[PDB]
Amino acid sequence: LKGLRRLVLDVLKPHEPKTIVFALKLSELENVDGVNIHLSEIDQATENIKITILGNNLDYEQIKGVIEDMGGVIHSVDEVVAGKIIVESVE
Amino acid sequence: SLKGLRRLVLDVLKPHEPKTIVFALKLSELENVDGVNIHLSEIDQATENIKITILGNNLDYEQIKGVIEDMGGVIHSVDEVVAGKIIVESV
Amino acid sequence: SLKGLRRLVLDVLKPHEPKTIVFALKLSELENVDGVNIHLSEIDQATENIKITILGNNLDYEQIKGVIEDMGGVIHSVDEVVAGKIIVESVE
Amino acid sequence: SLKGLRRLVLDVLKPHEPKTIVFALKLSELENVDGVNIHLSEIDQATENIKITILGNNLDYEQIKGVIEDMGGVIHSVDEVVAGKIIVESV
Amino acid sequence: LKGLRRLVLDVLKPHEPKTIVFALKLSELENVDGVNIHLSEIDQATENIKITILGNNLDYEQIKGVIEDMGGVIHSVDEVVAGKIIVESVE
Amino acid sequence: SLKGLRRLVLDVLKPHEPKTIVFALKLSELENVDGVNIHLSEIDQATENIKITILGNNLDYEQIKGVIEDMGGVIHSVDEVVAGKIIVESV
Amino acid sequence: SLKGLRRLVLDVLKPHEPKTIVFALKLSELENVDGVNIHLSEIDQATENIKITILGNNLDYEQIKGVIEDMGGVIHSVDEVVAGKIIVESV
Numbered sequence: 001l002k003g004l005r006r007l008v009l010d011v012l013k014p015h016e017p018k019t020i021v022f023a024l025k026l027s028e029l030e031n032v033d034g035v036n037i038h039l040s041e042i043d044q045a046t047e048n049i050k051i052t053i054l055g056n057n058l059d060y061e062q063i064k065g066v067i068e069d070m071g072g073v074i075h076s077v078d079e080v081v082a083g084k085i086i087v088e089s090v091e
Numbered sequence: 092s093l094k095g096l097r098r099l100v101l102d103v104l105k106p107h108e109p110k111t112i113v114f115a116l117k118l119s120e121l122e123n124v125d126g127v128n129i130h131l132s133e134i135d136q137a138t139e140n141i142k143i144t145i146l147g148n149n150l151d152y153e154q155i156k157g158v159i160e161d162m163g164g165v166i167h168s169v170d171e172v173v174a175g176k177i178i179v180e181s182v
Numbered sequence: 183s184l185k186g187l188r189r190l191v192l193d194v195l196k197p198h199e200p201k202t203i204v205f206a207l208k209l210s211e212l213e214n215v216d217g218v219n220i221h222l223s224e225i226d227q228a229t230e231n232i233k234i235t236i237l238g239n240n241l242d243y244e245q246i247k248g249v250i251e252d253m254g255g256v257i258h259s260v261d262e263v264v265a266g267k268i269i270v271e272s273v274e
Numbered sequence: 275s276l277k278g279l280r281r282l283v284l285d286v287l288k289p290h291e292p293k294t295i296v297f298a299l300k301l302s303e304l305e306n307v308d309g310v311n312i313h314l315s316e317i318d319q320a321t322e323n324i325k326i327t328i329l330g331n332n333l334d335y336e337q338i339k340g341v342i343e344d345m346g347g348v349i350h351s352v353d354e355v356v357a358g359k360i361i362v363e364s365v
Numbered sequence: 366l367k368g369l370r371r372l373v374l375d376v377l378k379p380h381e382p383k384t385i386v387f388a389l390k391l392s393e394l395e396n397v398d399g400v401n402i403h404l405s406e407i408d409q410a411t412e413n414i415k416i417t418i419l420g421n422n423l424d425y426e427q428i429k430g431v432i433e434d435m436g437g438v439i440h441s442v443d444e445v446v447a448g449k450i451i452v453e454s455v456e
Numbered sequence: 457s458l459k460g461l462r463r464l465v466l467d468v469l470k471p472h473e474p475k476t477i478v479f480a481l482k483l484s485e486l487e488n489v490d491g492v493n494i495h496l497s498e499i500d501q502a503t504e505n506i507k508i509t510i511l512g513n514n515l516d517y518e519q520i521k522g523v524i525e526d527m528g529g530v531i532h533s534v535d536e537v538v539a540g541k542i543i544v545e546s547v
Numbered sequence: 548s549l550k551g552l553r554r555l556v557l558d559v560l561k562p563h564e565p566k567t568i569v570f571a572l573k574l575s576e577l578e579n580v581d582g583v584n585i586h587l588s589e590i591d592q593a594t595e596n597i598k599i600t601i602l603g604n605n606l607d608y609e610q611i612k613g614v615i616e617d618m619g620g621v622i623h624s625v626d627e628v629v630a631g632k633i634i635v636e637s638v
């Protein structure tokens with residue numbers, strides 16, 4: 001258990017494909033334990049989704065690749081957890 | 092083994108009849124479904140807004156949507172999707 | 183064996199009598215009912231609005247509705263339903 | 275066997291005497307009462323408003339009512355009732 | 366496990382002695398398992414404190430004596446828990 | 457044996473130097489101190505207000521106050537205190 | 548031995564480049580560090596404000612500060628410090 005452990009991505013995307021498709025593909029990466037997609041807000045042609053990815057030594061670029069290949073773009077990385085222990089934010 | 096779509100939060104519109112209970116039962120009788128939670132969002136005239144949370148393993152979206160429509164329901168939005176081996180909650 | 187209806191949150195309106203502790207007792211005595219929670223939402227002139235939470239296994243809605251209605255209450259709406267092997271909570 | 279009335283929350287009005295500690299002790303001394311919690315809601319110039327939560331097995335309402343009345347208090351309302359094998363919480 | 370188990374007191378006391386001593390003396394009473402003193406507000410010559418006393422079969426008169434013999438006064442009993450099971454107030 | 461001052465929540469005022477890191481460090485090296493948490497409440501032109509939480513057994517206030525003093529800090533108030541065999545939280 | 552600085556929460560300012568993932572990775576690769584959490588507070592024109600929480604044992608601040616500065620980061624303030632054997636949370 002090392003490297004990138006959890007990422008929270010601010011992603012913008014068209015209506016297609018559906019977020020279940022995004023979720024599935026991402027979840028199928030080998031170093032990924034689970035993926036959560038939260039619909040932030042849908043608009044006229046786009047959709048704003050918050051993706052939480054849990055894993056072990058996650059390959060950002062890989063993750064960004066799957067996302068972009070499906071027409072989505074990453075607007076920002078909101079949270080990054082790295083290491084042996086999943087450290088939560090102290091608000 | 093646990094994989095695929097694990098949880099779906101669905102925004103659904105439907106007529107008073109049949110009652111949410113039938114939906115819950117029918118959805119819960121699906122093969123990979125562990126459980127189903129149907130929360131009433133708001134009642135209107137001849138209409139009813141519910142939030143459907145379906146937990147299970149490698150769930151079939153299409154099979155779920157099918158059940159719902161087969162009962163006069165319609166899916167307005169997919170609010171949250173969880174996929175993978177571990178259930179990940181939104182940060 | 184866990185299956186069927188597992189939990190219901192019923193919005194019920196009823197005259198003052200019988201008291202809610204009687205609704206609770208009667209509902210709790212039903213077979214397959216693990217427990218019952220009756221929350222008082224508001225008291226009116228000659229009526230009360232109460233929230234009923236029923237836990238159990240493979241619950242029979244009609245039977246539960248029967249008890250509530252035999253008792254003088256009316257179900258205005260089913261606010262929550264849970265069905266299946268696992269009691270899944272609502273994600274907020 | 276665990277059954278009957280399991281937990282009550284009572285809206286009680288009482289004179290300043292006797293003290294809430296006397297109500298709590300006396301009620302906790304009842305045959306099938308596991309515990310009692312008295313939360314002071316408001317002290318008025320000649321009376322007080324308390325919320326009495328009583329936990330137990332097959333609780334006797336009339337008996338609990340009696341103890342409260344012999345002590346000079348009166349039950350204004352029954353806010354929550356729990357009954358059966360398991361203690362269920364409101365959702 | 367019988368009698369008074371928890372008490373929450375609204376106490377008024379002059380600046381001296383320090384709460385550090387209240388908590389310390391009270392914690393030293395026979396049937397007390399622990400004491401939590403929370404500072405509500407401090408004024409020009411006094412301060413309002415919240416005393417949480419946990420234990421088994423607590424003696425109110427003893428505690429009250431210890432409080433007064435130190436200069437503080439009990440303005441009110443905010444919560445009382447009696448019995449075999451520590452029952453929290455249902456909100 | 458677990459007794460006396462168990463936890464303290466200290467409101468402290470101190471010049472920017474020495475840094476809170478040194479404060480936490482020297483306090484944590486005290487005899488019966490299990491751990492220390494220093495929370496920066498507010499920085500000012502020449503001073504900063506921190507909240508200090510000290511966990512341990514039969515803690516010595518005089519000692520704690522001493523160390524804080526020596527580094528130029530000052531205890532403005534004692535917001536919370538726990539004493540006794542068991543750690544009791546406020547209700 | 549479980550001692551010293553256990554957890555730190557640093558308010559940091561930095562240019563968009565390099566990404567926060569590299570910071571999170573590099574800080575997690577430091578000896579003594581069990582895990583790192585970088586929360587995005589805000590993105591500005593040429594800058595970015597992040598809150599970094601570091602967990603581990605007997606952490607070296609000067610080392611952490613260096614890694615950050617070596618990457619263009621700057622520590623505007625140390626918001627929380629935990630030191631000792633047990634991780635203590637702010638009350």
Ligand SMILES: [Mg+2]
Binds near residue numbers: 042
């Ligand atoms: Mg919009």
Ligand SMILES: [Mg+2]
Binds near residue numbers: 133134135
């Ligand atoms: Mg409407």
Ligand SMILES: [Mg+2]
Binds near residue numbers: 224225226
């Ligand atoms: Mg009304």
Ligand SMILES: [Mg+2]
Binds near residue numbers: 224226231
């Ligand atoms: Mg009304």
Ligand SMILES: [Mg+2]
Binds near residue numbers: 195
């Ligand atoms: Mg209604």
Ligand SMILES: [Mg+2]
Binds near residue numbers: 193258259
């Ligand atoms: Mg209703």
Ligand SMILES: [Mg+2]
Binds near residue numbers: 285350
């Ligand atoms: Mg009232």
Ligand SMILES: [Mg+2]
Binds near residue numbers: 316317
């Ligand atoms: Mg009044």
Ligand SMILES: [Mg+2]
Binds near residue numbers: 316
């Ligand atoms: Mg009043």
Ligand SMILES: [Mg+2]
Binds near residue numbers: 351
């Ligand atoms: Mg009332």
Ligand SMILES: [Mg+2]
Binds near residue numbers: 406407408
């Ligand atoms: Mg004042």
Ligand SMILES: [Mg+2]
Binds near residue numbers: 406408413
């Ligand atoms: Mg005052």
Ligand SMILES: [Mg+2]
Binds near residue numbers: 375376377413
């Ligand atoms: Mg007062």
Ligand SMILES: [Mg+2]
Binds near residue numbers: 498500505
């Ligand atoms: Mg100031």
Ligand SMILES: [Mg+2]
Binds near residue numbers: 498499500
């Ligand atoms: Mg200021």
Ligand SMILES: [Mg+2]
Binds near residue numbers: 589590591
């Ligand atoms: Mg700005």
